[PDB]
Design a binder for this molecule. Structure first.
Ligand SMILES: CN1CCN(C(=O)Nc2ccc(F)cc2)CC1
Length: 435
């Protein structure tokens, strides 16, 4: 596994012990062989669970999710997938790790795809070894993998709106349910319906994940309503998963705007990870998995793989060479390697728009490639009338940094900046020059 030029896919079933049993064994062996090693966690919650599994081993935690006093002699670093890609993009020196371990390697956010691309390229070059840990590698077609204990799988119509009748099985249950919804707005409606029926509901999404996930441990709950972020190693003490089997798909139209298409079917890998939240206790057989649709290969033409190419085109590898996507996921995007490579100043703007600006990769690239500087927000107001962002059925308005009230009408429209109330609030602050 640890030899140069080797990439191993550790694909044991969900709950088989990849993170808590296998990972410490690999790390102990890497330390014995003096391999400079990186361990990539998908989220801060996983980074904290990894410190518990690796306690006693000399690991440098490059995350504020863990409060540890680092000796300075560690040769094993642990950080999130996003932090690894961010440090590669920034002028900072990232060590040339001999062994690269990615946990929850199925993560399809642009920074995780780019991290796989870079690492797999280094392995192909003969410079490093890598281990990708996931039950569902790219292209898997099995939505029903093995589990620690038998699961009751039932195809059933699942509500995606508030309901008054016809779904008694949903509320008649007396255990704990994790329910996967296609979007934050859809979860808000279902959570309100369940709360009105007397249930205790916790909601999780990317922006609220670390904070709200703690509530699943600190208080009693009946339902967790979550987007796809809970496919990335989130553990619950639940006995049922309700799975809409739907997700939103960012799609670039005519190379000039991004829409959130769908809801549409999830991939088999997503379905297997959603189901994989339950059936984890060998002493509790009969956990239920209720699913409301089929799977499809909705990662084909999905914006995240084009965004991963934008990030890889702007990471130094060697001279003018550019890292390729990891081979099993390299056909998801029609893209030319190097087409998004930016000159030094525009690249710095692109990075700052993602890091400080908190903009989606595609949108950050359109602004930087137009030669616009980070603090110049005129583009948030000079788009066509059809790019007007709406707030409760009327044009959204902001006071510009000049003190003028203006309608929010970006030159490039990316639906992700206004997909929910929190996203629109953050984009309004950006349009106003507040960060
Ligand atoms: C609304 N989102 C929040 C998270 N986000 C991000 O994770 N970007 C990023 C891109 C590249 C990279 F390498 C690391 C992070 C910015 C936009």
């Amino acid at each position: 596994m640890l030899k140069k030029k080797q990439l191993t896919v550790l694909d044991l079933h969900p709950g088989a012990g990849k993170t808590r049993r296998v990972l410490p064994e690999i790390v102990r062996e890497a330390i014995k062989k003096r391999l400079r090693t990186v361990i990539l966690a998908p989220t801060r919650v996983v980074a904290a669970e990894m410190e518990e599994a690796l306690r006693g081993l000399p690991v440098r935690y490059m995350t504020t999710a863990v409060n540890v006093t680092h000796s300075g002699t560690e040769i094993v670093d642990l950080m999130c997938h996003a932090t690894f890609t961010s440090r590669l993009l920034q002028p900072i020196r990232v060590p040339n790790y001999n062994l690269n371990i990615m946990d929850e390697a199925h993560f399809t956010d642009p920074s995780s795809i780019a991290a796989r691309g870079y690492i797999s390229t280094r392995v192909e070059m003969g410079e490093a070894a890598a281990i990708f840990m996931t039950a569902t590698p790219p292209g898997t077609r099995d939505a029903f993998p093995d589990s620690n204990s038998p699961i009751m799988d039932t195809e059933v119509e699942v509500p995606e709106r508030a309901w008054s009748s016809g779904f008694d099985w949903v509320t008649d249950h007396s255990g704990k349910t994790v329910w996967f919804v296609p979007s934050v707005r859809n979860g808000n409606e279902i959570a309100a319906c369940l709360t009105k029926a007397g249930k205790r509901v916790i909601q999780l999404s990317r922006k609220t994940f670390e904070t709200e996930f703690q509530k699943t441990k600190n208080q009693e709950w009946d339902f967790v309503i979550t987007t796809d972020i809970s496919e990335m190693g989130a553990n619950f003490k639940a006995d049922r998963v309700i799975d809409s089997r739907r997700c939103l798909k960012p799609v670039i139209l005519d190379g000039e705007r991004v829409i959130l298409a769908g809801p549409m079917p999830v991939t088999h890998a997503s379905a297997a990870q959603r189901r994989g939240r339950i059936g984890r206790n060998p002493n509790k057989p009969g956990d239920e998995y209720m699913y409301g649709g089929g799977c499809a290969e909705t990662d084909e033409g999905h914006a995240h793989w084009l965004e991963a190419r934008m990030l890889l085109d702007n990471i130094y590898l060697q001279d003018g060479l550019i890292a390729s996507l990891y081979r099993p996921e390299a056909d998801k995007v029609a893209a030319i390697e190097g087409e998004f490579k930016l000159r030094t100043e525009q690249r710095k703007t692109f990075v700052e728009l993602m890091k400080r600006g908190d903009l989606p990769v595609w949108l950050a690239y359109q602004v930087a490639s137009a030669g616009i500087t980070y603090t110049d927000r005129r583009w948030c107001f000079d788009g066509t009338t059809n790019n007007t962002i709406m707030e409760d059925s009327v044009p959204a308005e902001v006071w510009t940094k000049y003190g003028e009230k203006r309608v929010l009408k970006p030159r490039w429209m990316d639906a992700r900046v206004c997909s929910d109330h929190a996203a629109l609030k953050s984009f309004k602050e950006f349009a106003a020059g507040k960060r």
